[PDB]
């Protein structure tokens, strides 16, 4: 239950030490489902400033917080009890930060689902979150180069999918437990390549390590949602709050691309006796990228990442104005169109 902690090099070049580190990261994910990375003073400072901005925002009146929403992007506020996981409400309040695109961006003009501007509460919160996410992204890129090297793949295998990647962050406050219900967030897996997470001192995150012989749902398939799976079955590892680290675990895309050599780590949050702040960062493919099986070149299966993101956020927030506008304007049909008639040059000739 004692997690490994690694210091990452600032730049990953493919030298023997980098390859060795990648092997160790893979082995830690395969054993524990998670590891820690040590933060330097700037990484820590930016983490703490984000947490502080989160605490200040959550003290604002509910009507103000609820105004920070968009019918174009899922960025913005989620009230306690608003998100659904496995048919049951989750109880953190959240501020989601997706790619911040104004109505001047061609993708927004074209009505691409989920594309639009973050409804920032104020410009100091904006600066704190953007600074933090730029640091988190540098770490995500290092981790992806290391992971490629550990699997004996070209160093750019995963970073070639994350140019202009759909990176996003959930800035969370869990209330203290006030009723008989201890569920903070139900068991689930996240959707992209990596999850990098930070937490305060309170405690409440649990993760499920790989279990020999245990079948894992492929959450990218509509018939194999991972939400709720294993909720009440051991083993669950408590992620002990530890100063000076971020945690890292794989998301759905890494499970798919590695054919299950890595598993998207199931995790859940239990409410504690005090309110708890955390941030979860998602290092994702480009919205237009298609993930593919790395070890089965003849396999026809693919995951269109933006389609997976969109499907997931629609199931998280079935009644949100963003979802209503996707349904009203049939923006899922435009997602089918953009697969073949996009102008961004993110994919294709
Ligand atoms: N947007 C998220 N990453 N939410 C994480 C919780 C699980 C999510 N409600 C789901 O049903 O898949
Ligand atoms: O609470 C934490 O430690 C962060 C992880 C919570 C989570 O699963 C998510 O937001 O996707
Ligand atoms: Mn999660």
UniProtKB/Swiss-Prot annotation:
Binding-site residues, Fe cation: 188, 267
SUPFAM superfamilies attached to this UniProt entry: Clavaminate synthase-like
The keyword Oxidoreductase is annotated on this UniProt entry: yes
Activity-regulation annotation: Activated by catalase. Inhibited by chelating reagents such as EDTA and Tiron (4,5-dihydroxy-1,3-benzene disulphonic acid), and by DTNB (5,5'-dithio-bis-2-nitrobenzoate) and hydrogen peroxide.
pH dependence (record): Optimum pH is 7.0-7.5.
GO molecular function: 2-oxoglutarate oxygenase/decarboxylase (ethylene-forming) activity; dioxygenase activity; metal ion binding
Pathway: Alkene biosynthesis; ethylene biosynthesis via 2-oxoglutarate
BP GO annotations: ethylene biosynthetic process
Source organism, top-level taxon: Bacteria
Reactions mediated catalytically: 2-oxoglutarate + O2 + 2 H(+) = ethene + 3 CO2 + H2O; L-arginine + 2-oxoglutarate + O2 = guanidine + L-glutamate 5-semialdehyde + succinate + CO2
Cofactor(s) in the UniProt record: Fe(2+)
Segments forming domain Fe2OG dioxygenase: 165-285
Temperature note: Optimum temperature is 20-25 degrees Celsius.
Protein family (similarity comment): Belongs to the iron/ascorbate-dependent oxidoreductase family.
Subunit structure: Monomer.
Protein name, as recorded: 2-oxoglutarate-dependent ethylene/succinate-forming enzyme
């Amino acid at each position: 239950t004692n997690l490994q902690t690694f210091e990452l090099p600032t730049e990953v070049t493919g030298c023997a030490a980098d390859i060795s580190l990648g092997r160790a990261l893979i082995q830690a994910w395969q054993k524990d489902g998670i590891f820690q990375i040590k933060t330097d003073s700037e990484q820590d400072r930016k983490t703490q400033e984000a947490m502080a901005a989160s605490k200040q925002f959550c003290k604002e009146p509910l009507t103000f917080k609820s105004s920070c929403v968009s019918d174009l992007t899922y960025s913005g506020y989620v009230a306690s009890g608003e998100e659904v996981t496995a048919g049951k409400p989750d109880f953190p309040e959240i501020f989601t930060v997706c790619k911040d695109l104004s109505v001047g961006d061609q993708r927004v003009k074209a009505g691409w689902p989920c594309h639009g501007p973050v409804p920032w509460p104020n410009n100091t919160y904006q600066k704190s979150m953007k600074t933090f996410m730029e640091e988190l992204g540098l770490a995500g890129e290092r981790l992806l180069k290391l992971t490629a090297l550990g699997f004996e793949l070209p160093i750019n295998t995963f970073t070639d999918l994350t140019r202009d990647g759909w990176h996003h962050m959930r800035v969370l406050r869990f209330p203290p437990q006030t009723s008989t219900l201890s569920r903070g967030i139900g068991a689930h897996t996240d959707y992209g390549l990596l999850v990098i997470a930070a937490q305060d001192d309170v405690g409440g995150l649990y993760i499920r390590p790989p279990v020999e012989g245990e079948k894992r749902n492929r959450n990218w398939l509509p018939g194999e949602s991972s939400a709720g799976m294993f909720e009440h079955d051991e083993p669950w590892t408590f992620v002990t709050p530890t100063p000076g680290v971020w945690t890292v675990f794989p998301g759905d895309i890494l499970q798919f691309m590695t054919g299950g050599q890595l598993l998207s780590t199931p995790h859940k949050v239990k409410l504690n006796t005090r309110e708890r702040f955390a941030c979860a960062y998602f290092h994702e493919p480009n919205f237009e990228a298609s993930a593919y099986p790395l070890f089965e070149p003849s396999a026809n299966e693919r995951i269109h990442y933006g389609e997976h993101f969109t499907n997931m956020f629609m199931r998280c927030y079935p009644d949100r104005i963003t979802t209503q506008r996707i349904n009203k304007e049939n923006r899922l049909a435009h997602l089918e169109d953009l697969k073949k008639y996009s102008d961004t040059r993110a994919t294709g000739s």
